[PDB]
Amino acid sequence: TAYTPLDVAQAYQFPEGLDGQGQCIAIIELGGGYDEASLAQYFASLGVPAPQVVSVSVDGASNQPTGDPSGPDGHVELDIEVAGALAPGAKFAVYFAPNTDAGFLDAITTAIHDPTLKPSVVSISWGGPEDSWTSAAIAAMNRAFLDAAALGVTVLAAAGDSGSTDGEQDGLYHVDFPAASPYVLACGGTRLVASGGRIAQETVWNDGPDGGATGGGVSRIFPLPAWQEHANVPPSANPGASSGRGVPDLAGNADPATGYEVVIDGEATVIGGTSAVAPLFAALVARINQKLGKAVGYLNPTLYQLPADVFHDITEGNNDIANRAQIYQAGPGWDPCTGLGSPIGVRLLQALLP
Ligand SMILES: [Ca+2]
C-alpha cells in the first residue's frame, strides 16, 4: 500500500481550515538538493497550492541536487513534499550544511536564530546514535535546542530507521541524537492501516534487519526529564540499567510497505521512514500555531500532561531488528517504540486552545 501526505493527515485527523499561513517552517538538510519547479508540480498533482520555498547556504553548502533519488535528494524532497503538502500556506526555509557535526550544528543554530525567515518550527531528519557525538557537539547542540525553546521554536527530530540498535552494530541498544535530546520532539515510526479517515491498524514499524525499523529506547546520556516520570519509562536495556530520556515522544506512519507516494528527482515512487514523520508533525504544529495566533514552541512537558485520548495509542510490535529479544516493545500508553503514539489533530489542537 501507500498514501499521499493528505491521506495520512486525514488518518491523523489534522484540523481543517489551517494551511500554516503566517508560519515559517525550517528544514535541515545535510547535502543533496531540491528542484523548485519540480516541487511545484508535485503539489499541483496533489491539488495543493505550491508553498513558497527558500534555500539558505550554510558553511559554504547549498541546494545541489545530484539526481540520485537514493542519495540525499530523496531525503531533501521527501522532507519538503511531506510538510509542504500539509502546511502549504506556510513559508519553507531549507538550510543546507556539510554532512558533519559542525555543519549540522551551524545549520540548526542558523535556522533557529534566523532574523529574517524566522521559523517557528524546526524539522530535522538527520542524526546519529548519541554515543558517537563529541561532547562539544552534544553540548552546543543542546545549547541550541535550549535556545529554540526560549525563542518559542518547536524542534522535531526523526528518531531513526534502524530499530533499537540504531545501526550501531556492537551488540548494545542505542538511541539517536538529536532525537534523544529532551528539548526535542522525537518522532518514531509505525505501520498505518487506515481508510476513510478511520484508523484500522497502527503498529510499530519493523520490517526487519533489512526493511528498517523505528528508532526508540532510553538515552543513557540524558536523564529522565521530570515530565516523563509518569510515562513509565524503563531503564535502558543495556547492562547497567540506567535511568534516561525515553525516546520517542510521538510516532507516525513510516513503514515503506504503507509508504508515501512521492516524486523524487522526476520519478514516481513510494517511500517511508521516520524522516517523513518529523516534517509531517511539523505541518501539524504550524497549523496549530496558525489557529492560536501564537507559536507553541516547546511541547514536550505539555504533551505528557494532556489527556491520553489526545493520542492514538500504539500497543503492538517492537523495534528490535537485532535479535528476538523484542527490545523495545510497544504497550499501553508511552512505550519506547512509538512514544505517546500518533497525535489526533483536532484533539491536540482543542487541548491547546486557551
Ligand atoms: Ca503505546
Outline the structure in words:
The PDB classes it as hydrolase. The entry lists the keywords E78H, hydrolase. The assembly is monomeric. By secondary structure, the protein is α/β, with parallel strands linked by helices. It has a single domain, classed as Rossmann fold, CATH 3.40.50. The protein has helices at 5-11, 36-46, 69-86, 101-113, 135-151, 208-211, 277-292, 300-303, 345-352; strands spanning 2-3, 24-29, 53-57, 91-96, 121-124, 128-129, 154-158, 176-177, 185-195, 198-204, 217-218, 246-247, 250-253, 259-264, 267-271, 311-312, 342-343. Strands 2, 3, 4, 5, 7, 9, 10 and 13 form an eight-stranded mixed beta sheet that branches. A three-stranded mixed beta sheet has the order 1-14-15. The chain is globular. The site of calcium ion has 10 residues, from loops.
Element order: H for helix, E for strand = EHEHEHEHEEHEEEEHEEEEEHHEEH
- Main sheet summary: 8 strands, mixed
Are any ligands bound, and if so which?
calcium ion
The overall number of domains is 1
Name the beta content range.
Answer: 15-25%
Query: What is the H level of CATH, i.e. the homologous superfamily?
Result: Peptidase S8/S53 domain
Distance between the termini: 39 Å
The Cα radius of gyration reads 18 Å
CATH architecture classification: 3-Layer(aba) Sandwich
Shape: globular
The level of helicity is 25-40%
Using the coordinates shown, work out and report the CATH topology.
Answer: Rossmann fold
Under the CATH scheme, which class? Alpha Beta
Helix/strand class: alpha/beta
Distinct helical segment count: 9
Give the number of DSSP strands.
Answer: 17
